[PDB]
């Protein structure tokens, strides 16, 4: 019978069937209630008249009643499956609290009646999608950025690092600097335009200082963006200042380490004997790692911190916007996974805490 894979993100849910090459459903992680429930696309379309709730904050489920609505919608409306008929693989953020893992397990077995379930760390699934079982993953999404070192499929929690900004923060910063330029973005629709500009026209400069120095004279830097209604926005140095924030969090006022330093700090927390393998298997995942130039810049910066890595290339898979989901589809389709599921019998005997024993 066919397993399900559901990747629960801060911004986007990706769901589908194990063994498929792509999720069947991708939709916003939002539940909307009136106000005086709608989920996903339909809540988005009616957002003006609803109280919209984002049940997943920085990767962590925080509103269980609304998360149950998201899962019910995923099964019944998007996938059109009876969850009692399908073993279900769910994803979780690195360092997801114990009590949250237990509640997800309880809800799956008691509310949705699944025959079997498993909870996998999102970064571990992206590593598998890249073909590897040992490596370090930089996963940067909408709400959270982590570095997750992994040894033979096991994340190493002591060494997981967090950068306290991700894609939403970058959208906000691009909006700020385009506003300084002279534009105004007051409505929700206008913010979505800025997010699209960010996704289409931004890039990571290899030499940031030189790029700033030469911007005013560049014949190639300025780009224009024309909306369907004929409005035009022009962008210049904001193209590379926006994602520069990943390397220099001071751009949005924070004293935090940038992504090259979190990567280095994470590897240095790991066993001496695995570090070389981590450097050689350093994999980008998540939407916020899609900027052109990110691998070249990471290589440059890591080489400055760890000169032994001069010739080592960063791994930037083309499918990394969906690599978490794809790794889950691969994993749950394999025979090695039959042993890994938590069965209903195991849950009946041990209760929700069984997830602590079985899923790491």
């Amino acid at each position: 019978t066919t397993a399900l894979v559901c990747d629960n993100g801060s911004g986007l849910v990706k769901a589908g069937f194990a063994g498929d090459d792509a999720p069947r459903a991708v939709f916003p992680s939002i539940v909307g209630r009136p106000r005086h429930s709608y989920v996903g696309d339909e809540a988005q379309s009616k957002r003006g008249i609803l109280t919209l709730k984002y049940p997943i904050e920085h990767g962590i489920i925080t509103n269980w009643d609304d998360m149950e609505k998201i899962w019910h919608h995923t099964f019944y409306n998007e996938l059109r499956v009876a969850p009692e008929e399908h073993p279900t693989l769910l994803t979780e953020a690195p360092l997801n609290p114990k009590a949250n893992r237990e509640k997800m397990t309880q809800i799956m077995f008691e509310t949705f009646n699944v025959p079997a379930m498993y909870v996998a760390i999102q970064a571990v699934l992206s590593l598998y999608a890249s073909g590897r079982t040992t490596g370090i993953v930089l996963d940067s999404g909408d709400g959270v950025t982590h570095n997750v070192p992994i040894y033979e499929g096991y994340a190493l929690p002591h060494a997981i690092m967090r950068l306290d900004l991700a894609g939403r923060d970058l959208t906000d910063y691009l909006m700020k600097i385009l506003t300084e330029r002279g534009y105004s973005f007051v409505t929700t629709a206008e913010r979505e335009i800025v997010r699209d500009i960010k996704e289409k026209l931004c890039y990571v400069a290899l030499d940031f200082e030189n790029e700033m120095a030469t911007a005013a004279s560049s014949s190639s830097l300025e780009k224009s963006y024309e909306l369907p209604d004929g409005q035009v926005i022009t962008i210049g140095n904001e193209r590379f200042r926006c994602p520069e924030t990943l390397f220099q969090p001071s751009f949005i006022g924070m004293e935090s380490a940038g992504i090259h330093e979190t990567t280095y700090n994470s590897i240095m927390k790991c066993d001496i004997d695995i570090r070389k393998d981590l450097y050689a298997n350093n994999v980008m995942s998540g939407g916020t790692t899609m900027y052109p130039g990110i691998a070249d810049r990471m290589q440059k910066e890591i080489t400055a911190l760890a000169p032994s890595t001069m010739k080592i290339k960063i791994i930037a898979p083309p499918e990394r916007k969906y690599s978490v989901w794809i790794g889950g589809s691969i994993l749950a389709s394999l025979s090695t996974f039959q042993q890994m599921w938590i069965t209903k019998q195991e849950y009946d005997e041990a209760g929700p805490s069984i997830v602590h024993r079985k899923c790491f």
């Binding site: 040894y151 033979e152 929690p157 927390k269 066993d271 024993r357």
Partner: protein, 139 residues
């Protein structure tokens, strides 16, 4: 019946290649282990690292069990509600590596090593159930 029966119980389902019961109170020594394998050779220094106050240095390049180098994956060994640590062995040359769980009872450490390809979750579940039995038995 004695502690060898415990080793038979732990080995019975075919998932593990090695198993041991090691006292860390009253009689500090290997009480039983699978003959000719790795845990039978655990030393008091290695037990000292497992139960010791330093929960950080074993992330420099691991710890050893019977001389076998291992990497720490999760450490909740000294937490009274969890009482477990998960490791995976380290090898050279791309030789296979194996998941290990250690659990802590009132008097013992229970150690289990999976066979090749056996998931760490299965090994943790079995070790935790055995430690839970021993703790219920005042051991």
């Amino acid at each position: 019946a004695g502690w060898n029966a415990y080793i038979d119980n732990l080995m019975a389902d075919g998932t593990c290649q090695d198993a041991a019961i090691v006292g860390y109170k009253d009689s500090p020594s290997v009480w039983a282990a699978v003959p000719g394998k790795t845990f039978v050779n655990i030393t008091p220094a290695e037990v000292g690292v497992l139960v010791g106050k330093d929960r950080s240095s074993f992330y420099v390049n691991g710890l050893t069990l019977g001389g076998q180098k291992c990497s720490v994956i999760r450490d909740s060994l000294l937490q009274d509600g969890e009482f477990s640590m998960d490791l995976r062995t380290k090898s050279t040359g791309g030789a296979p590596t194996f998941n290990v769980t250690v659990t802590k009872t009132d008097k013992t450490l229970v150690l289990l090593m999976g066979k090749e390809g056996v998931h760490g979750g299965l090994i943790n579940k079995k070790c935790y159930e055995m430690a839970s039995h021993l703790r219920r038995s005042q051991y």
